[PDB]
């Protein structure tokens, strides 16, 4: 027989057919999946008086455990099953309620924002309800559902109850972001946006996906602070870091201006760097669990040798700041001292009038001032061979993976900002963001400027042609722009940044799949032109939308600080050496655009930035950002058992894919990054990769490391993010 405990409390015979029926519905359309296999594996685990919820997790996980490259469709059989369990868990049945009914329930329960009911009428809800296709929950992969369940759907912290499905998330994120539009266009926008996201064309960051609809207003997750050379400013920088990390934000600190050990910060940078680290980790489980930062400094800082080794797992404690990453800032002069095998002179910023500023803003003025200050006896300084410092940096970058490079001249010669007014003098946690900053001198100092960015990405895998990107750019740029007026500003300097420039950073996911589906490869140059054509489409249509929005609503108050304001487009300023690696003609009318921007302005001083991705690219089953996958199958560790995600369309494309460690070397990838940088407003989270078993005696030569460091400078690459070294 075998009895079954229900949700109420009484038994009743087990309904083996009801199961096989749900199981049947679920394999709808999928190929290569055995239903009997799933029953034979779950049913053996069923015990007399087992409860309903258990039967249901048992059959999900059994579907789940069958995911392999050979039978990838299980990915979906397990999802649909989980999707089903989650409907019953939320609404007690399959059909979700009417959206208006649902919203009122959620508001009274205090889990949705009441603003939703003041902003839309029941008839407007009844109409939104018609846009919803609840059948789209059927298209998530299983690794997707696991992420929804854990990070996205509105739920219970404590009891663990789940209150909404995915289509209710998408529709309400849409309602909220587009709620202030006028009646003529609003619900058209809500529909057209809802569609873009629920079909995986536009991807949103976690705090947006998790919080837009609920009473919260915290969504800034990406802050950039610059610290001045005074106690007040360090106190201000620290306090600001504190505020922002309490709200789960990654931070880019520029502490380069701090004066060196034993200057007339008398006790030097390191003790102040430590103080930043504790600010950063002020809101973390044991002192490692959330809160993250990258700190920046110029390569010529007097204490650089001592800063290069801060996260080194050897050494003594008063010389170690290990729970932060660093970006070393380099320009053409340094690299020239490297090629010519001469020295680099270190100076403390406090002793060299306008060297620091010329570093970022005017490379000639730097030349003049550097050689000038080198010659002057009265100035405290320090010489070291340039082969030495570069090796030290590279030896550290290799050892930890996380000593990063900013090429600060590229950031200012090829940028949306004019460096005489608003220079880019740092990046953020992941090296994709590049924005101007002003140091504060109190937390609430109004003359300060901390930089924020609001992020997103197109799914290159989901669009059927480049011109599909027009609508998507419009949707993306409008949503994130509404978001800016919507979210909270804990620090006045941070509002000034966001209100004054309204900067955005929209990237891509699914580059690798995209490359495969057009039968190209990272490593050999076969993809240069496709990549050039693609990022043209991208930048162009992102500007076009921001231009159109600037007409309808006003360009951004500090638009006149940009190059764009003067008629200078990225296509005028890209590193000229790219000319030698691609010949793809421009396809779109950039002069029409030149004039239209110059006249009407832009809503957003920046629009593009290539960021890393993991959560987001799981939800759509897409390759991560622009990176080649390590393998065909991803493994995540989870209380619910092993999570597997097979790269999109494996069965047809396993020989199309170029996997990470199958690339002969870094050269094609960097050519591809550099081609993106021709059109991207900010930077790219660009990796370097080294397989030790490709090198004599299993050891990576300092020669290849530097030769690659220069390949990237030459092709105009602004930043280098992680180094990955494979084991064996």
């Amino acid at each position: 027989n075998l009895l079954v405990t229900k949700r109420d409390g009484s038994t009743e015979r087990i309904n083996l057919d009801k199961i096989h029926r749900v199981l049947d519905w679920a394999a709808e359309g999928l190929h290569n999946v055995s239903i009997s296999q799933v029953e034979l594996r779950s049913h053996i685990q069923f015990y007399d008086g087992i409860k309903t919820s258990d039967i249901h997790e048992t059959i999900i996980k059994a579907a789940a455990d069958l995911i392999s490259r050979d039978a990838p469709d299980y990915q979906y059989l397990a999802a649909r099953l989980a999707i089903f369990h989650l409907r019953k868990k939320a609404y007690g049945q399959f059909e979700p309620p009417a959206l208006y009914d649902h919203v009122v329930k959620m508001v009274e329960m205090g889990k949705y924002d009441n603003h939703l009911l003041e902003d839309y009428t029941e008839e407007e809800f009844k109409q939104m309800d018609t846009f919803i296709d609840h059948d789209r929950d059927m298209t998530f992969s299983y690794a997707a559902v696991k992420q929804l369940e854990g990070k996205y759907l509105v739920q219970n912290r404590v009891t663990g109850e789940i209150y909404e499905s995915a289509q209710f998330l998408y529709i309400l994120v849409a309602a909220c972001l587009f709620s202030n539009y006028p009646r003529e266009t609003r619900l058209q926008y809500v529909k057209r946006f809802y569609d873009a996201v629920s079909t995986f064309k536009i991807s949103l960051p976690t705090p947006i996906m998790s919080g837009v609809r609920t009473p919260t207003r915290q969504f800034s997750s990406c802050v950039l602070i610059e610290c001045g050379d005074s106690l007040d400013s360090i106190n201000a920088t620290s306090s600001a870091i504190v505020k922002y990390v309490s709200q789960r934000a990654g931070i880019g600190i520029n502490a380069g201006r701090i004066r060196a050990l034993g200057s007339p910060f008398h006790t030097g940078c390191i003790p102040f760097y430590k103080h930043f680290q504790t600010a950063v980790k002020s809101c973390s489980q044991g002192g490692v669990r959330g809160g993250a930062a990258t700190l920046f400094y110029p390569m010529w800082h007097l204490e650089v040798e001592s800063l290069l080794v801060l996260k080194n797992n050897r050494g003594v404690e008063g010389n170690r700041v290990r729970h932060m990453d660093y970006g070393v800032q380099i320009n053409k002069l340094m690299y020239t001292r490297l090629l010519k095998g001469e020295d680099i002179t270190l100076f403390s910023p406090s002793d060299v009038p306008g060297l620091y500023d010329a570093f970022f803003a005017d490379q000639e003025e730097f030349e003049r001032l550097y050689t000038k200050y080198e010659k002057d006896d009265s100035i405290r300084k320090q010489r070291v061979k340039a082969v030495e410092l570069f090796s030290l940096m590279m030896q550290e970058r290799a050892s930890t993976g996380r000593i990063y490079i900013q090429n600060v001249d590229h950031c200012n010669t090829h940028s949306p900002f004019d460096p005489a007014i608003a220079p880019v003098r740092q990046s953020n946690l992941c090296l994709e963001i590049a924005l101007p900053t002003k140091p504060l001198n109190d937390v609430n100092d109004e003359n300060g400027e901390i930089a924020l960015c609001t992020l997103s990405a197109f799914n290159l895998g989901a669009i059927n042609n480049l011109d599909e990107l027009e609508e998507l750019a419009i949707l993306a740029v409008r949503a994130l722009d509404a978001l800016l007026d919507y979210q909270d500003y804990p620090i006045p300097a941070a509002k000034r940044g966001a209100m004054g420039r309204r900067t955005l950073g929209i990237g891509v996911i699914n580059f690798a799949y995209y490359l495969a589906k057009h039968g190209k490869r990272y490593s050999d140059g076969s993809a240069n032109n496709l990549t050039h054509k693609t990022f043209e489409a991208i930048q162009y249509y992102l500007l076009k939308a921001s231009n159109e929005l600037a007409k309808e609503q006003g360009a951004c108050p500090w638009f006149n600080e940009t190059t764009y304001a003067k008629g200078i487009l990225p296509i005028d300023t890209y590193k000229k050496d790219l000319d030698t690696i691609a010949n793809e003609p421009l396809h779109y009318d950039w002069e029409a655009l030149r004039e239209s921007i110059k006249t009407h302005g832009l809503r957003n001083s920046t629009l593009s930035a290539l960021m890393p991705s993991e959560t987001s690219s799981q939800i759509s089953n897409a390759t991560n950002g622009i990176e080649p996958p390590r393998g065909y199958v991803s493994i995540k560790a989870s209380k619910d058992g092993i999570l597997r995600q097979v790269v999109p369309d494996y069965e047809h494309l396993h020989d199309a894919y170029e996997l990470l460690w199958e690339m002969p070397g870094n050269d094609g990838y960097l050519q591809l990054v550099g081609i993106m940088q021709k059109f991207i407003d900010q930077s790219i989270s660009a990796n370097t990769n080294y397989d030790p078993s490709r090198f004599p005696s299993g050891k990576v030569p300092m020669q290849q490391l530097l030769k690659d460091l220069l390949t990237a400078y030459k092709f105009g690459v602004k930043t280098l993010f992680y180094q990955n070294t494979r084991d064996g």
């Binding site: 053409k332 095998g341 082969v387 090796s391 990576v700 020669q703 030769k707």
Partner: peptide, 16 residues
């Protein structure tokens, strides 16, 4: 790990 040796005359041939 990493092979300390660096050739400057190799390098001097790179154009930035």
């Amino acid at each position: 790990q990493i092979d300390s040796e660096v050739d400057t005359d190799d390098l001097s041939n790179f154009q930035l």
